[PDB]
Design a protein around this ligand. Structure first.
Ligand SMILES: Nc1ncnc2c1ncn2[C@H]1C[C@H](O)[C@@H](COP(=O)(O)OP(=O)(O)OP(=O)(O)O)O1
Ligand SMILES: [Ca+2]
Ligand SMILES: [Ca+2]
Ligand SMILES: [Ca+2]
Ligand SMILES: [Ca+2]
Ligand SMILES: [Ca+2]
Length: 903
DNA sequence: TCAGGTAAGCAGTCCGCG
DNA sequence: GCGGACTGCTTAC
């Protein structure tokens, strides 16, 4: 097999590389890497190497990396460009793997672990590590085994051995319900003392050295705790045995609360699962506890125990150990669904970077482009300092707040990347400039044609159309991958709706789920076989389909993120190819395109509907338009349709057969105007929206920019079994909105759109009466807690202190002394509740860490003093007032003269 | 060794307001 | 008690 790296590191004048050799063996090597950089030279003659602008460069081969760094400094002091790849390990990887890396994941050691540390005096701070590690579960992906290290003897208690027979039993039978499919995979190892545990753990780590280290919050807890604990007992160089190159970096950041540590383990690639989750999940969660995310992702119940965790080991060591193991397995289960580690490996190896750099699209794209240009023997430019400058982005149309009955939307595919490809925007393809003119003049096709020679953006820039650029070339490759995965995603989605329709008529039989590839639309014969299946097998098939759809989602949305990040990176001062000319060429062209097609769509629909000056496009954001279809429906009559599906088929046909060609004509004209290299503005129908036929629902409404709701029947070719709410921007979509309020506002919205005003009043009435009965956690608001120190005096509110920060400070006073109370972590989310005037807490609100119950010592007072009236008014009524007044609806009955008609 | 982007809504603080 | 000028946070793209 072809070799591939595992990790790369630069230590001195040495590169340290772990790799997989041609026999599939893991090896490590130290290489005295001799790097090259470049300098502009005469011309004039005979070089071979050219910078991206075509200017000749001479190659400087250095005896070591130190010398090449020093030479870089001298060139700066002289005032001359030092060209070439200055991150030498990227250069090393590029030289050593000069071919497309095909990797074998079964040879890459991916380690999942977590530790337990009993602490009788508050959170065990890793930077201190003054309490014993009493449990480690470490899952190795090569062995497919959970290695459990369990401390029996501790200054905080002596316990008996953990029992695997008890662990396996149902919780209802006194066991721990450790999943059956991992019971045979546990290798349990008890210890009579912590030193022997830690020694054995380090020895184990030498034999089975992680390449990818992950887990839940391992970067901020597990890793620094283990490092500092070992350092405190054995000395630092023993703790350095966690690095295979025996090299670590300890970054501090201190006070005032206050002091944490991130340990860098050279020769390892840490990918904390919380960081993967945050970057790649496209959720915003009110909490990032593992219980919370596990529930969300897997529908598993929280790991229940009695008493504080500080006492769990001594009261129920059996459960303590089992939960340590289960928490490790849960991260694996989430990864099985989400596939972020796969994504990371795919991305790292494609780009030729350290795997942990997949977090940085700038590092990722510097490597991709570097590698692309090196193949053509071109020399990359030096990175320069730039001052940060604000610049213009997208256009958002101001909508008339109203109800909108029948709505069709249309969207440009992968817009910013498509603009880069269409215009040919790249650092080395800049042709020149032209005299601009106001954007409005281009939108209305009245401005002078920018050029008849070069490809243009309305920001003033001209690009060559016969050369091709590194950015369009490399962005097209990732884009093409994205659309493939999006196709798998959508097919799995459509196939999912086929199973759901079939679930209306399950057969009374005993059978098996079909063996099919959910990435491809079902064939007629698979569809027939499905009509004969039992519910149990259909439900199994739906779950597999949905998993296929999630997998596709991860693959496609994150490739989308990578290419969109290339367009933004052009506007970041640390990007080697930073250039506001290019960044604004994308955003300004985008602004023109949306408004251009608004005009063209208004022009087309006025023609076909025999009218003039009527506004069909009711709204647009960045690359999308929303078209009122009321008049289209009216021209035929609601009379008249057989059912809901009938008018949806009609709008679908009208969008596909009439509107899309008119749109395509509009954009081809715009491509001609801008004299672009390639037409790539592909605007396809997205959603079909409206009420159920013969109901009183309003179909949709807008309240303002980025705030609307639609009752959607078809979405990108997926015809739903049951209509789905597309809600954007509203409080239902925000993580700061209390759980039960999200749920209540959604049902309020559902009733408005599908059922009508009357139904809405019914529900509101009930929710208002029942509000005070809801659990306090479900009605708490959530907020991130940044910049706490700034506003602390303390421990009282400073000037302009935000509400949520005020509540934290109130919490911090209420939990002085007694240490069973968990502390608020800077940058993390908190629950927030208003308090009634005169409360014993001495302020208008309180806040505590989200995902958790408020400590039992103050919980009773919070519950007694919670201001329900203010809660309901702030979180539910005020938002609902916004929705209903926009939609010309009332959530409770108004006037009226009729009032006096029951006696 | 640290670094995709901008547009834009709403909650809240401070202040003005016989 | 509720507006405008700010900060903070959060979402849509
Ligand atoms: N996370 C982001 N980072 C940077 N730019 C973004 C991001 N999301 C959206 N944009 C910008 C670039 C996009 O091309 C443009 C339109 O957004 P959007 O419609 O969500 O995706 P898209 O048009 O790129 O892909 P799709 O094919 O899924 O429609 O807005
Ligand atoms: Ca734990
Ligand atoms: Ca789009
Ligand atoms: Ca689309
Ligand atoms: Ca059937
Ligand atoms: Ca869009």
């Amino acid at each position: 097999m072809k070799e591939f790296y595992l990790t790369v590191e630069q230590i001195g004048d040495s590169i340290f590389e772990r790799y997989i050799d041609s026999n599939g063996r893991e090896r490590t090597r130290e290489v005295e890497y001799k790097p090259s950089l470049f300098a502009h030279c005469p011309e004039s003659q005979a070089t071979k190497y050219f910078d991206i602008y075509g200017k000749p460069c001479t190659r400087k081969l250095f005896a070591n990396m130190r010398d090449a760094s020093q030479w870089i400094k001298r060139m700066e002091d002289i005032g001359l460009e030092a060209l070439g790849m200055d991150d030498f390990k990227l250069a090393y990887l590029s030289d050593t793997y000069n071919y497309e890396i095909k990797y074998d994941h079964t040879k890459i050691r991916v380690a999942n672990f977590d530790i337990e540390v009993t602490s009788p005096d508050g959170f065990p701070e890793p930077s201190q590590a003054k309490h014993p590690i009493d449990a480690i579960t470490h899952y190795d992906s090569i062995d497919d085994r959970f290695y459990v290290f369990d401390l029996l003897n501790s200054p905080y208690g002596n316990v008996e051995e953990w029992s695997i027979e008890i662990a396996a039993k149902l919780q209802e039978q006194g066991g721990d319900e450790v999943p059956s499919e991992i019971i045979d995979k546990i290798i349990y190892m008890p210890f009579d003392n912590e030193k022997e545990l830690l020694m054995e753990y380090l020895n184990f780590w030498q034999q089975k050295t992680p390449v990818i280290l992950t887990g839940w919050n391992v970067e901020s807890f597990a890793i620094p705790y283990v490092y500092n604990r070992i350092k405190n007992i054995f000395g630092e160089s023993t703790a350095k045995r966690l690095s295979p190159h025996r090299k670590t970096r300890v970054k501090v950041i201190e006070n005032m609360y206050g002091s944490r540590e991130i340990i860098t383990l050279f020769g390892i690639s840490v990918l904390d699962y919380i960081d993967l989750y945050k970057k790649f999940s496209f959720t915003n969660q009110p909490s990032y506890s593992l219980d919370y995310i596990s529930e969300f992702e897997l529908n598993v119940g929280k790991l229940k125990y009695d008493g504080p965790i500080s006492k769990l080991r001594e009261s129920n060591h059996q459960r303590y150990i089992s939960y340590n193991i289960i928490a490790v397995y849960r991260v694996l289960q989430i990864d099985a669904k989400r596939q972020f580690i796969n994504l990371s490996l795919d991305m790292g190896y494609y780009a030729k970077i350290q795997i942990q750099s997949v977090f940085s699209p700038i590092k990722t794209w510097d490597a991709i482009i570097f590698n692309s240009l090196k193949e053509q023997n071109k020399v990359i430019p030096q990175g320069r300092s730039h001052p940060v400058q604000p610049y213009p982005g997208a256009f958002v149309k101001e909508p008339i707040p109203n109800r909108y009955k029948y709505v069709m939307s249309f969207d440009l595919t992968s817009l910013y990347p498509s603009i880069i490809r269409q215009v040919n925007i790249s650092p080395e393809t800049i042709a020149g400039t032209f005299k601009v003119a106001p954007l409005h003049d281009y939108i209305n096709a009245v401005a002078e044609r920018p050029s008849d020679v070069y490809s243009c953006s309305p920001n003033g820039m001209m690009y060559y159309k016969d050369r091709d650029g590194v950015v369009p070339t490399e962005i097209t490759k990732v884009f093409n991958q994205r659309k493939e995965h999006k196709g798998y995603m959508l097919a799995a989605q459509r196939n999912g709706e086929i199973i759901k329709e079939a679930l209306h008529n399950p057969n009374l039989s005993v059978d098996e789920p079909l063996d099919v590839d959910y990435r491809f639309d079902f064939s007629d014969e698979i569809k027939e076989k499905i009509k004969k299946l039992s519910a149990k097998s259909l439900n199994e098939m739906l779950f597999r389909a949905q998993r296929t759809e999630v997998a596709g989602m991860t693959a496609q949305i994150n490739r989308k993120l990578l290419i969109n990040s290339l367009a933004g990176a052009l506007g970041n001062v640390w990007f080697r190819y930073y250039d506001l000319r290019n960044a604004t060429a994308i955003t300004t062209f985008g602004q023109m395109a949306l408004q251009w097609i608004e005009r063209k769509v208004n022009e087309y629909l006025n023609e076909v509907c025999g009218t003039e000056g009527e506004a069909f496009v009711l709204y647009g954001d960045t690359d999308s338009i929303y078209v009122s279809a009321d008049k289209i429906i009216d021209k035929v009559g609601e009379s008249k349709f057989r059912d809901t599906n009938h008018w949806v088929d009609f709008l679908d046909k009208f969008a596909r057969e009439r509107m899309e060609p008119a749109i395509d004509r509009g954009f081809r004209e715009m491509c001609e105007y801008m004299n672009n290299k390639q037409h790539l503005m592909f605007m396809d129908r997205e959603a079909i929206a409206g009420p159920p036929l013969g109901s009183k629902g309003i179909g949709g409404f807008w309240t303002g920019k980025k705030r609307y709701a639609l009752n959607v029947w078809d979405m990108e070719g997926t015809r739903y079994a049951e209509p789905k709410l597309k809600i954007m921007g509203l409080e239902t979509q925000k993580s700061s909105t209390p759980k039960a309020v999200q749920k209540a506002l959604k049902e309020c919205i559902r009733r408005m759109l599908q059922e009508g005003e009357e139904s809405l009043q019914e529900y509101f009435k009930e929710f208002e009466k029942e509000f005070r009965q809801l659990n306090y956690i479900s009605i708490a608001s959530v907020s991130s807690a940044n910049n706490i120190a700034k506003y602390d005096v303390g421990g009282f509110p400073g000037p302009k202190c935000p509400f949520h920060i005020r509540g934290i400070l109130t919490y911090n006073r209420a939990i002085k002394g007694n240490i069973d109370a968990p502390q608020v972590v800077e940058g993390e989310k908190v629950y927030v509740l208003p308090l009634r005037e005169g409360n014993p807490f001495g302020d208008k609100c309180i806040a505590w860490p989200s995902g958790t119950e408020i400590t039992d010592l103050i919980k009773d007072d919070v519950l007694h003093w919670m201001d329900y009236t203010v809660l309901l008014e702030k979180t539910f009524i005020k938002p609902l007032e916004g929705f209903t007044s926009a939609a010309k609806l009332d959530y409770e009955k108004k006037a009226s003269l009729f009032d006096m008609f029951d006696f």
